[PDB]
Ligand SMILES: Nc1nc2c(ncn2[C@@H]2O[C@H](COP(=O)(O)OP(=O)(O)OP(=O)(O)O)[C@@H](OP(=O)(O)OP(=O)(O)O)[C@H]2O)c(=O)[nH]1
Ligand SMILES: Nc1nc2c(ncn2[C@@H]2O[C@H](COP(=O)(O)OP(=O)(O)OP(=O)(O)O)[C@@H](OP(=O)(O)OP(=O)(O)O)[C@H]2O)c(=O)[nH]1
Ligand SMILES: Nc1nc2c(ncn2[C@@H]2O[C@H](COP(=O)(O)OP(=O)(O)OP(=O)(O)O)[C@@H](OP(=O)(O)OP(=O)(O)O)[C@H]2O)c(=O)[nH]1
């Protein structure tokens with residue numbers, strides 16, 4: 132007795148389009164920046180749209196009506212892209228270059244690089260909106276972007292496996308050990324400049 | 326003497342324009358399919374004009390050879406070709422794209438309304454989009470050729486012949502296939518319309 | 523009370539790998555053939571793995587045990603690739619170039635081009651096996667290949683929509699009208715040779 | 717005088733070799749992940765040696781300049797770089813690939829067992845595969861560099877410096893990062909192994 136999967140299938144479709152739109156902006160920046168300064172800020176990107184089960188789960192946790200309309204108006208990380216950068220300073224270069232764009236707007240920002248989480252997690256999280264041009268309408272949609280270095284990706288990926296303690300203490304060691312190395316690398320890369 | 330190759334810049338920013346249009350096109354195809362359960366775009370092809378082709382074009386229109394002047398005189402530096410499943414898709418794509426805020430129409434030539442002498446049929450529009458570079462916004466024209474499969478079939482073959490080009494023997498016979506393809510693709514369209522009701 | 527989705531998810535995984543393997547052989551042929559004769563036989567390819575529902579449905583129709591093992595040993599078109607060619611004669615060039623390969627074996631062949639189906643359908647269907655090299659074993663798997671021209675693809679795609687009559691008679695007209703045009707095209711293309 | 721560019725042939729068939737190996741690698745990654753719920757390959761990178769690099773290499777080994785002789789003397793014409801998530805993945809990939817019937821091992825140099833003077837670490841193997849061309853079968857060597865992310869991080873940076881190359885100031889300090897990366901990536905591996913039980 133319902134049609135509830137109609138907006139969710141709809142949901143996934145329009146939010147992937149937002150990822151396609153943002154991915155493009157990112158690639159052109161990386162391309163052009165490299166074309167100007169002989170250096171790629173972006174090592175690579177990853178895109179994912181939240182599974183429906185995670186959406187419904189998340190809606191239930193905050194006690195909200197279970198519909199695509201309500202997920203659409205309450206969940207900002209439905210569409211997610213992860214930008215992995217070669218160097219720390221690249222992270223903030225991308226953030227700047229993306230936000231200054233006309234159709235791109237900043238909604239939420241959390242910088243766990245300056246202020247890592249308790250367990251050691253480091254990463255710049257921003258939510259932006261872009262317009263998505265559909266066959267018969269324009270949707271302005273939020274995309275969640277995680278900007279991190281290779282090192283931050285490495286550590287995050289492992290700590291994440293553990294969620295599915297004894298390792299808490301030892302992970303924090305790696306988190307700073309990685310910070311330490313990537314700054315050596317950053318320092319050396321900088322001295323050569325372009 | 327000293328590197329006059331500003332074109333590498335040209336090639337760089339105009340290929341970026343193609344990514345932006347291509348992204349737009351792909352989303353229209355995707356969303357229209359999600360709504361009317363049918364993909365208008367069969368596929369797309371993208372190309373940035375060879376520098377060899379540019380200078381030749383500049384030479385022909387009697388223009389100075391610099392990237393700067395090509396940027397403001399050649400609209401088909403960046404080109405994309407949208408091959409559609411059915412005749413009516415050609416005009417759906419045209420409509421869906423123009424209605425987008427950041428797409429601006431510059432030029433339009435409809436060789437479907439008025440096929441060329443040799444039989445060529447195709448819808449040509451030039452649009453502008455903004456390209457967001459690391460340090461500036463460049464607004465660039467992309468030339469878009471919209472056609473059906475048959476029109477594509479025919480075009481690519483005619484291109485091989487003319488582009489020692491004899492034609493001659495085939496001009497007459499190519500024009501026959503051009504019309505024969507039109508006729509059938511209308512049969513196909515007629516049928517497709519009736520069942521999508 | 524079962525694990526029946528384990529082999530099916532397994533099934534889809536190993537059969538896509540077969541598609542990756544066959545796709546590659548095809549691309550190298552198209553690439554190299556064009557590199558030698560300045561002409562691409564392949565306009566494009568399409569790959570698809572049968573949905574589980576279609577597999578189960580098909581198993582039920584022939585009254586077979588419902589398991590991935592049994593689908594694996596009875597259904598040859600689990601993995602399918604559709605090679606669309608620019609010209610009719612290209613179809614048989616590809617067939618030859620693919621079958622002569624050491625790791626490629628012909629299992630089933632149906633040529634609806636010489637002998638179209640009653641409704642007008644034209645297409646060369648072959649089933650081949652390739653070995654698929656997995657982490658811990660080698661599977662030899664069947665892939666079903668449909669080789670057709672652009673014209674044949676066009677007609678097929680439309681006739682297919684109709685399955686989901688008045689149009690039967692009129693489709694057959696298009697089927698031969700398309701044959702007629704593509705042969706004109708074939709004739710003209712041939713006269714220029716390479 | 718007359719087109720000596722047999723290399724375009726060379727570039728053509730060796731890029732075909734990369735497609736065949738790349739396909740193999742991708743399937744191993746996919747299947748291993750399906751079984752042990754973990755991707756060994758983080759990503760891959762492919763490259764066919766620039767002709768500029770080839771002739772230079774031929775010049776250095778004092779060989780005649782022809783595609784024919786390069787074909788039988790240069791094993792790294794086609795090269796692929798497999799970046800892995802964990803140290804142990806490097807050897808899993810090595811093993812899974814060699815056990816394939818049509819992959820034949822030609823050469824092996826393990827700079828992880830024995831890192832170079834400057835700190836470089838990486839597992840180098842040359843394999844042969846058959847390439848099925850339109851009219852023949854060519855058996856070609858591909859050079860494969862297998863490394864962890866950290867080894868990749870470090871390598872790409874060291875490459876920028878040496879490839880006016882000062883090094884000097886950084887050699888010492890690069891070697892420090894090389895060891896610092898090793899140490900941590902073993903911490904990571906140690907932890908990952910314990911939880912995958
Ligand atoms: N590896 C790792 N990632 C962290 C950690 N803390 C945050 N993150 C990242 O932050 C992303 C969003 O998680 P949070 O915002 O912190 O919590 P949420 O459930 O999303 O509710 P909230 O957005 O805050 O309102 C995660 O998305 P994910 O899809 O990646 O995971 P996952 O899906 O498990 O989150 C992670 O990428 C951490 O301690 N370790
Ligand atoms: N096959 C074919 N195409 C035609 C014909 N008339 C126009 N076109 C297409 O229109 C595009 C440009 O032709 P025109 O606009 O009429 O002339 P211009 O663009 O000003 O100079 P230009 O053609 O680019 O050198 C071409 O793009 P291209 O990238 O394809 O090449 P190509 O352009 O070389 O033909 C053709 O594909 C025709 O009679 N046959
Ligand atoms: N458009 C069209 N295709 C036909 C027609 N006859 C055969 N085909 C193609 O042949 C493919 C396999 O269908 P068949 O072999 O004829 O019948 P099967 O159900 O597969 O059992 P069988 O293989 O013979 O033992 C189809 O796969 P599909 O995935 O494409 O469809 P679809 O999934 O509906 O088949 C079609 O691609 C036809 O009259 N029109």
Ligand SMILES: Nc1nc2c(ncn2[C@@H]2O[C@H](COP(=O)(O)OP(=O)(O)OP(=O)(O)O)[C@@H](OP(=O)(O)OP(=O)(O)O)[C@H]2O)c(=O)[nH]1
Pocket residue numbers: 773792795832834836870871872874875
């Ligand atoms: N960054 C770095 N790489 C090393 C080092 N030693 C070996 N390599 C890698 O090994 C590859 C070839 O180096 P060698 O095998 O030792 O020497 P040869 O292959 O015989 O000549 P060649 O290097 O190709 O000119 C390179 O491939 P490439 O494609 O990367 O370039 P590149 O090869 O230019 O270094 C390097 O990536 C090192 O000290 N630092």
Ligand SMILES: [Fe+2]
Pocket residue numbers: 152345
């Ligand atoms: Fe855009």
Ligand SMILES: [Fe+2]
Pocket residue numbers: 543736
């Ligand atoms: Fe193979």
